[PDB]
Each structure stands twice: as structure tokens, then as C-alpha cells.
Amino acid sequence: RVKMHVKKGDTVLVASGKYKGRVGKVKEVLPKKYAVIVEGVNIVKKAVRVSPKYPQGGFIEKEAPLHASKVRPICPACGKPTRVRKKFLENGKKIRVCAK
Amino acid sequence: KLSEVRKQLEEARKLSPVELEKLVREKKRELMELRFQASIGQLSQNHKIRDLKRQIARLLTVLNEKRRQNA
Amino acid sequence: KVCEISGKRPIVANSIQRRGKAKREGGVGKKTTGISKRRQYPNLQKVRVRVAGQEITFRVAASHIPKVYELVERAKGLRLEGLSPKEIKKELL
Amino acid sequence: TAYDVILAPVLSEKAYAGFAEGKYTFWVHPKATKTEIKNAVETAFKVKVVKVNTLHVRGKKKRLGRYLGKRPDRKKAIVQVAPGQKIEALEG
RNA sequence: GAGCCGGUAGCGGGCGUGGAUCCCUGGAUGUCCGAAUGGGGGAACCCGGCCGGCGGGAACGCCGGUCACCGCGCUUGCGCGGGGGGAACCUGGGGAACUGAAACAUCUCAGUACCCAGAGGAGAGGAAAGAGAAAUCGACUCCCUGAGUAGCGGCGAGCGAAAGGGGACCAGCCUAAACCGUCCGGCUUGUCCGGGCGGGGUCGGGGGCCCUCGGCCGAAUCCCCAGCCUAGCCGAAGCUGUUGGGAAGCAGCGCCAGAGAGGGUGAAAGCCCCGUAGGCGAAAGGUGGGGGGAUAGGUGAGGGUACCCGAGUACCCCGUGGUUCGUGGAGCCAUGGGGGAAUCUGGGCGGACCACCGCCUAAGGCUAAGUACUCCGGGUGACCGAUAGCGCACCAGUA
RNA sequence: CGAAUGCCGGCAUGAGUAACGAUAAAGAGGGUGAGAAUCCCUCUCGCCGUAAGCCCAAGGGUUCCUACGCAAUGGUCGUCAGCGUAGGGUUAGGCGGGACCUAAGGUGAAGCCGAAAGGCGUAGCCGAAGGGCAGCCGGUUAAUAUUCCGGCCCUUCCCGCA
RNA sequence: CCUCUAAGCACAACCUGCGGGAACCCGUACCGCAAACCGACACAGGUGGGCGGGUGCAAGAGCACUCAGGCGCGCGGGAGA
């Protein structure tokens, strides 16, 4: 709803910036931010556990957002923008020379 | 929830004003009991409240539609 | 105020003071030496009248008085009474 | 109705002391009357109400950053229960 | 069509392809104040009557319904209506001053500002008792002309038309009165008076009534559709390499184009995203002669009678207003006061007034469209870019 | 843009200056705390006492009590506060007002007047610190009390009885 | 509040006992001659009502001291023109 875009929880290839060429699963989508997730962008956040119950929370720290225009879905073949087919009854998305 | 709602209506929709009234009276009570132990902390799971206020909205909405051609 | 018959109501007019020989005589002509607002009122009067049982008065401009003695003649051909001094006048059109 | 007039219970050291006598006290919807309350309670706890004292509470006014507001105002009623009777529900 | 549980962060908990959140339509619920309308009142609060319900309820309190006033109608009660609001815009009722006149009074500003009442998507006006000199034209409104002309004017300052022509729009209708019927309520109970319905009748010469001749157009009204607004949908074509945190730069080699508007993507991208060109779409509620239908409605000649063609009206005088017209030679339009006709040999007008000649048929009403305005939705900009642009980019009509 | 005693803003100078708001007046010993002339406690000293004491109206509207705080506010200081944060606290048939009364005055059926807006006005309605009217003394809280509690005492409705 | 009579009604109705029931809404903290009210301020200004003890001076709400109670007035320390 004005929010909507390209992909959902699935395998997508990044073409981004730093993580250019990357192939990652489920993008865990926003779309408030038009952002996604993959295993692309990663950083360290500093911590001491929300409650020092199990002391430190840890230190590896997880994935940044990443603009949804950076990713590009994929199937039998590569990237491909999505196209949208009638189906004769409902409506699904098929990739250019492909399906789903 | 969604399917639960769907069914909650199905029954509600075939009760009679008299009975809706009585049932409401009960949900109204449960709700009090909630907001009591809501208000002491000692046991309370948030969603359970909005859930029952709407339950009740639903019933009373239904009771209105009944009351036009029936009583 | 206003004539209940005619609808006549005070109108606004000017009061113009002049001086001078009218051009149409000795000449030079006249000179307005002051204009000012003022009103002209209709010549309103009071007409008490019997009709049916009850007494009924009009507020009416003198020009139109007869017009009432027309109605009273048009009023004869009617069903009326029933303690209604004012309710007559209304029905008297 | 009835479970709409009684809202919650007080909860204060003052309000507790109260329970020694049959004096339990409740936040109650502020338009309700002494009578409304008496009957509302009679039906809520099947006890016998013998006296009602009511009082309003100007809601405190409080802040959060530059946003200045009020809390909602309330009314509380402190209700007497017949001798021997008690409301088990309120005895925490 | 995959994420949600507002402006999200957190505790604490839940929901969703068993198709959620979200968007549009309709419906339900909608405390109290406010036209505020049971009564009162210092707005958002107090206090009542009647009907019916809850509690042990008779006192007491809760719930539901209902009870202002005014105007029109029809059998005293019941129906319709009204009321208040609205950014401008409109009409009407009232109506200034600074100012200008290089002082100032006539004059100007200006019937402006403002106050009041009213109207609505518009309002006003509108089918000639018109214009005005043409064997003339033919409702009204709006634009351009006509023209700063004609004129008005302490002939100062200044004010300032109309016919005509070019355009937009296009539309004409219903009554009153003679006469005929009918109901009613009075009386002086009559071949009658006047009140109500219906018929008839609507015009520059017509209508009624008596005597000879009998046939299509058609709504502004109602109905159905088309279309249109309130959510949406589909939509061509790019990879690699290179610097760089980051390519969309630079390079190699491609492709689409009814799409090379524009924004975004780590920098500068037709071919990544949102779009654009081009083309789809409404169950629901709005809108809707634009295209159909259907009503209401409209459809003659002669020859006679002279029965009717809107009254305190015309007309004249007094006092004023409007018009370009300031008492002028001062008509026309309107009317506070006085006097006061006629029904076509009737009557108004063509700038005092007479006489010819001609124009028009007053004293009842309705009428779209072409015109104005921008609260609101959208599109554009040799418009602003945070001392600018609205007072307000920000929780401002706030502190 | 350099001048308009210009407009908004920022930053100087006077300047470590005048002032710190009643000449009722202070001192010491202990606590507390990073820090104390300024907070707590004690003891000495002074001032008010038809008050500068106590209680009520109006006005103010949480300033009340308690626990944390000390950036700012406090004319210094601050560990304190009427300041910040949080949580608590106001209990009535008899107190006061309302389901009673009328005063000036307001409103206002009828009625009158006015270009519109509106102005008057009889009854009535509104209108109080005035009339009418049933509660005293104690005890409780950190913070309310004629309101809670105890003792004694009253008033009005409705119903039944004699 | 007493009393008088009107329609009415006297199987009502008042009056006096006595018993049992019923008894809403609003205010109630705190300041209150003041640092909490009006004075832009914790401003030497203004603010209606009541209580306001004791001893002495002829009296008194005056004047001096003082009870209860409350305060030393939210910058100090020195000097000694």
C-alpha cells in the first residue's frame, strides 16, 4: 500500500555496493524503509546485555537493512526484473523467460 | 484468532437478544477480572484484553443487527 | 413602521437646502447649500373594526384605508369566529 | 452495565488498612452515583452494601520532554460491607 | 497479496496466503457542550414531567423512549417546513471618514469600507407598456468594441453612459379577468352575493360568447442507460571490467523506445527501484438527457356582438432616489404625501410641451446555459528556499 | 548598503564595578555528605505577640505527604526547597452550595415599539454573603475529618400500625 | 410555618404518636496580610470576616515586657578613612 515492492521472504541476489554479487536467502523485508536484510550488510553494535542476565549479550552483531533496490530476485537463471502474469484465474509473478 | 472470530460470529448470529445480553454480561465480568489482575501485574497477558473488548464489540454489534426484525 | 396592507415602509430621502435665483428667472442659478439624509414615513393610521364577533385593528397607511373596507366585504362569505381576535386578521389575509 | 461502573480497586497502604472493616474502595466511573455504586457492587460480589462514601481525584498533571499534559481524572468510592461479610476477591 | 498490532524504541504479549495490517464503499456504535430545542445555566454542569425497564425498591438511583419555539396546511392533535454554519463569490436593507479639490461647504473618496438580512453552487437578471431614427432591431447575462466618445461638472478637481458592431450562450413558460361547471355559508332564501376547487384563457392586437370548416411537435418533469468521481491494475530493454567506502563515473561489448517526463538507488543510470508512453478497472455510494424513452404540455379559418384584457394602479402635483444628467430646456425608471382614470376612441413611450408619424401593451409569477469565487482535489512555474515562502517547513494561531 | 535615534540576531564597553530587596542578630558543639556560614539535631543569644500567633472567606489550583534527585530556578551556597522524578493524599442526610425563597438586576408568555440587527415589558423564571434549615465533644493518618471511628443527639421523604 | 375555606373527596385525606425502610449531585489537600492572592520578581506596596492570654501605666484593641505559638527577614568575613 504505497509501501510495496519487488521481493519478499526468499532467495535474492544482491548487486549492491560493498556486498555486490552475493546471493542470500530471505530478505526479511521492511518496507517502511524500503529495506531488506539477506546476509549482506553486517556491523558491530556495542552492548552490555539489556539486563546483565547472562552477562554480556555477546559480540558478533548482526545484519544491516540494505535498500530494496540493491537486491534482485532469481530463478532458473539469474537476477531478472519480475514480470506479472494473468494465470487464467488468479495472478502470480513470473521472471522474464522463467516462472515464480 | 481470525478463524476463531469467524466462528464466534457464526454462533453469536443465532442466539437471540435475550441470550446475547446474558453472554455479554459474562464477558463484561471476565473483563473486569482482567483489568483487576491487569492492574496488580500478578498475571496479565496484554493481548487477552484488547481481544475481549472486541469480542464484546462483536456481540453488541450483532445484538444491534438482531434488534430490528425480531424484538 | 410598515403598512399591513400595502407593505409601504419609511424610505430614505435627502433634504437639500438651496439658495439663489432659479436660472429660469433672473438667473445665475441655484446653489445647494447642504444636503442630508432623512426619512419619509408612510401616513400610518389605526382602523378598529368589528367583523365576525371580535374587534380587530389595522396598522395601515391612510392611502389604503378603503382597501380594508374591501376585505370586510370579502370576509362575509366565510366560516369564522371561535375566540380569535388576532386569528381573524391573519385569516383576513 | 454493572461491570462498567466498577473499574479497578485503589491499591494503597491507606486503602488496605481499610479491609480490616468492611471498607473496600474502588476507582469508579466518575458519573456514577452513590446508589449506582451500591447496586453495582451488590451484584458484583453478592455482598450487602451498607454505606458508600465517594470522592473525586483531580488527575495529576505530568510532563514528558516539552510535551505538557494531564492524567485522566478519577473518582473513587469506598464501600461498607455488612457486618460479618467480606469480599474475598479483594483480600490480597 | 506478505506482512501486521498508528507517529515503534523498549519492556509484556499477540495476529497473518485458514489470506492479516493497509485502502475505497456502505452499515453499526457514537458520552457531554454547541442552532441546542423538557426546564435552568457562569458552554461541555445542575434540575424536571410523562411511557416503559433494572435493584429488596415505595421513598433513592440507574437504563431506554419522549416532551422548545415559530410558520404553513388539513377537525384543536397530527403532519410537513423553519432555526444554525460556510474561504471567497452574489443579491438586498442600511451606510462613513481620512483623502482629492494644493484651504473649504457643492463636488470627490464612494454606494467604497463597514453593519444587518437573505441566496446558492452560484447569485442577480431574463422574454419588451424595450431600444431609438434605421423600409431598423427583437428575452437576460458575460467578454471585445463603441469611448475617455456622448455628456455631466463650485463647466473646478474630477465623473462618465447607451445605440450599433464583433463574440460566448441560446428558451422560453405558467397565471389573473371575461365565460362555463361544482362545492360551501350567509342571509333581504334570489334569475344572488362571495369564498374554495376544476375547466377555460394568456396576445401587438389577443381572449370570451354566438353563427359555416377537424390534422404533429414535446419538456426545465419522471425513468433507464452511456459516460464520470470516490480504492486500483498491467506496463519495453544490461552484462562485464576499472578507480573508489560506495558507480549510476571511466572503459568494452549489447539492447528497449507510442516509454530519452521526473524522482530514488552509497557519486553522474532509458535498460536496478518507483515511474513514464500506451492501455486496463467498480460489487458499493455519489454524478449523470450526454443517448434513449415516458408523461405534463402545445396542435384552425372566417362573420357577428362588443362581455375581459391585473387599481389607490396609471395620471398630475409636492418631496427624493437611480441614469452621463449637480434644477438644467429635465424627459425616462423608482416612490414617502395629496388628489385620482379608462379596458383598445383603452393606455406608457420616442428627452419640457403641442401636432403629425412610429414603438410597445404597465400595475401577477417562473425560467436553464454562456458569468463570478476558490474552503477543497489535481496540473504547471525565467515563484521562495528557513531574517525567504503563509504568521506557522518544526505539535502555531501555539508559547 | 556604512549611515534611515533603521529591522532581526550575535557579541563588546561601563566592570570584576553598583548591587545581592528592610539595621529583629547572632554564636558554638555534634550529625550528614565528594563538598556545609547556608541542611539535620542540641544548647546559648535576639525579634514578633490586637502579631510577624491561630481560624475563615476570596483568589491560586497540587504548591499537600513520603521516597529518590541537584543541571536549571533560589539574588551566595545548597546535601535544602514551594525546584526535578515517582508514588501517595481530599470520604458529609446534619458544614457550605444545589433537587427551598425572594432583593437590586437580568430574563421574559401576553402586550408595545423599532429600516434589519434590535429596544421595552405584565405574570412567570433566573438571581444571595439576605430569609429558611437537621451535630456536638473526643480519638485516629505521613498527609482528611462536625466528612473515618467512638459516645451521646437530631431532620426529611416512603410504607405499615394505633 | 400557622389558619380559612374552593372545586373535589369523605373505603379518601390530613393531624399526632410509634415502628420499619429510604436519604442523590458538587465542594472538602495545601497557601491564605502572604515566597503559594493583585502587584513582570521568594517585589519593604495592596487584600474582607472571626479569636487574639498575662503584668503594669486612670482607661483601652494604646504603650513596655511577655504566654501559646512563630520568627533572625536565602550572600558572608573583616576593617574602623
Distance between the termini of chain B: 31 Å
Helicity level of chain C:
10-25%
Largest sheet properties of chain C: 2 strands, antiparallel
Percent helix among the residues of chain B? over 70%
Treating each run of at least 4 consecutive H or I residues as one helix, how many helices of chain C? Answer: 2
Structural class of chain B: mainly alpha
Largest sheet of chain B: none
Shape of chain B: elongated
Provide the β-strand percentage band of chain B: under 5%
Give descriptors for this structure.
part of a larger assembly, 4 chains, A: 100 residues, mainly beta, two-stranded antiparallel sheet, 0% helix, 14% strand, elongated, D: 92 residues, alpha+beta, four-stranded antiparallel sheet, two-stranded antiparallel ribbon, 2 helices, 18% helix, RNA-binding, RNA-binding (chain D)
In short:
This is part of a larger assembly, with chains A (100 residues), B (71 residues), C (93 residues) and D (92 residues). Chain A is an all-beta fold and 100 residues long.
Describe this structure in words.
- Chain D: GO terms for molecular function: rRNA binding; structural constituent of ribosome.
- Chain D: One of its GO terms (biological process) is translation.
- Chain D: Keywords: Ribonucleoprotein, Ribosomal protein, RNA-binding, rRNA-binding.
- The structure is cut from a larger assembly and holds chains A (100 residues), B (71 residues), C (93 residues) and D (92 residues).
- With 100 residues, chain A is mainly β.
- Helices cover 0% and strands 14% of the residues of chain A.
- Chain A has no helices and 4 strands.
- Chain A has a two-stranded antiparallel sheet.
- Chain C is α+β, with helices and mostly antiparallel strands.
- In chain C, strands 1-4 form a two-stranded antiparallel ribbon.
- In chain C, strand 5 and strand 6 form a beta hairpin.
- Chains B and D meet through helix 2 of B and strand 1 of D.
What secondary-structure arrangement, pairings included, does this model have?
This is part of a larger assembly, with chains A (100 residues), B (71 residues), C (93 residues) and D (92 residues).
Chain A: E1 12-14, E2 71-73, E3 82-85, E4 92-95
Antiparallel strand pairs in A: 1-2, 3-4
Chain B: H1 2-12, H2 17-38, H3 47-66
Chain C: E1 11-14, E2 18-19, E3 31-32, E4 37-40, E5 44-49, E6 56-61, H1 65-75, H2 85-91
Antiparallel strand pairs in C: 1-4, 2-3, 5-6
Chain C binds three RNA strands through strand 1, strand 3, strand 4 and helix 1.
PDB class: ribosome
Keywords: Ribosomal subunit, translation, ribosome
Entry title: Crystal structure of thermus thermophilus 70S in complex with tRNAs and mRNA containing a pseudouridine in a stop codon
